[PDB]
Ligand binder design. Structure first.
Ligand SMILES: Cc1c(C)c2c(c(C)c1O)CC[C@@](C)(CCC[C@H](C)CCC[C@H](C)CCCC(C)C)O2
Length: 251
């Protein structure tokens, strides 16, 4: 717990908001753990985290799950029960289950923020990071319409230095040709570190995906035990149960 007192001292004297977030030990330790207890880097991440929140009320003010319960019910998102071989939490997102006539890109971004605020409370996740699998099957121009240059920049920011989770891997599967232009909007804002941790698997993804996530994937992606629907429903239930933690850190 080195740097804790120092980190809290800098924050209080920079006039960081006492906000809806008390500078508890557990809160500040998210930032220290994300940056391997490098005080200067944890402080930069902390400042960026508040800056990111202040810039995007739309995504960050209401972490109440009621707005995006529809998206969860549609099967957009679940979190695997087991960790990967190095202890990362593994998140799955399915574009085909995002109706862009119904949910905005900000609503969809809010889903990741909500999940991220919940899983960051796990010390094992703070230490070993996360991997996210994005199944891009069914991506439409109507999805891309909603990814503006501002949205692309905000995506880059949470992947790099604006949220206290280590992104240890991003796996894009079933990526169509028309997606390449969307990614090229995000690319210029990414560090070389993160760029090297993005995997573009294509439409023949199974072998490589199984290599990275042995024995823990849903049936849909070559695993053997549970379905995506099971995992979606379980994460949905957990998020609904979390309504009051999420309310405590809203607005
Ligand atoms: C803390 C944290 C957040 C908040 C987060 C992600 C990760 C890994 C995090 O650790 C990944 C997903 C993202 C960036 C929200 C993305 C929302 C958009 C609308 C999804 C569809 C459009 C994307 C073009 C699809 C590919 C995105 C990957 C390249 C990350 O939100």
């Amino acid at each position: 717990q080195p740097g804790l007192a120092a980190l809290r001292r800098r924050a209080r004297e920079a006039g960081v908001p006492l906000a809806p977030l008390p500078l508890t030990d557990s809160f500040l330790l998210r930032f220290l753990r994300a940056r391997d207890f490098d005080l200067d880097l944890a402080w930069r991440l902390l400042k960026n985290y508040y800056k990111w929140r202040a810039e995007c009320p739309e995504i960050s003010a209401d972490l109440h799950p009621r707005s995006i319960i529809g998206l969860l019910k549609a099967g957009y998102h679940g979190v695997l029960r087991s960790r990967d071989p190095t202890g990362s939490k593994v998140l799955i997102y399915r574009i085909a289950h995002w109706d862009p006539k119904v949910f905005t890109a900000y609503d969809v971004f809010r889903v990741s923020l909500i999940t991220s605020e919940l899983i960051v409370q796990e010390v094992e996740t703070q230490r070993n990071g996360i991997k996210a699998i994005f199944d891009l099957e069914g991506w439409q121009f109507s999805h891309a319409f909603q990814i503006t240059p501002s949205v692309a920049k905000k995506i880059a920011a949470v992947l790099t230095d604006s949220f206290p989770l280590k992104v240890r891997g991003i796996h894009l599967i079933n990526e169509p040709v028309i997606f390449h232009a969307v990614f090229s909007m995000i690319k210029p804002f990414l560090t070389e570190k993160i760029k090297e941790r993005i995997h573009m698997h294509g439409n023949n993804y199974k072998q490589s995906l199984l290599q990275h996530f042995p024995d823990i994937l849903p049936l849909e992606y070559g695993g053997e035990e549970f379905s995506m629907e099971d995992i979606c429903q379980e994460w949905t239930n957990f998020i609904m149960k979390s309504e009051d933690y999420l309310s405590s850190i809203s607005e």
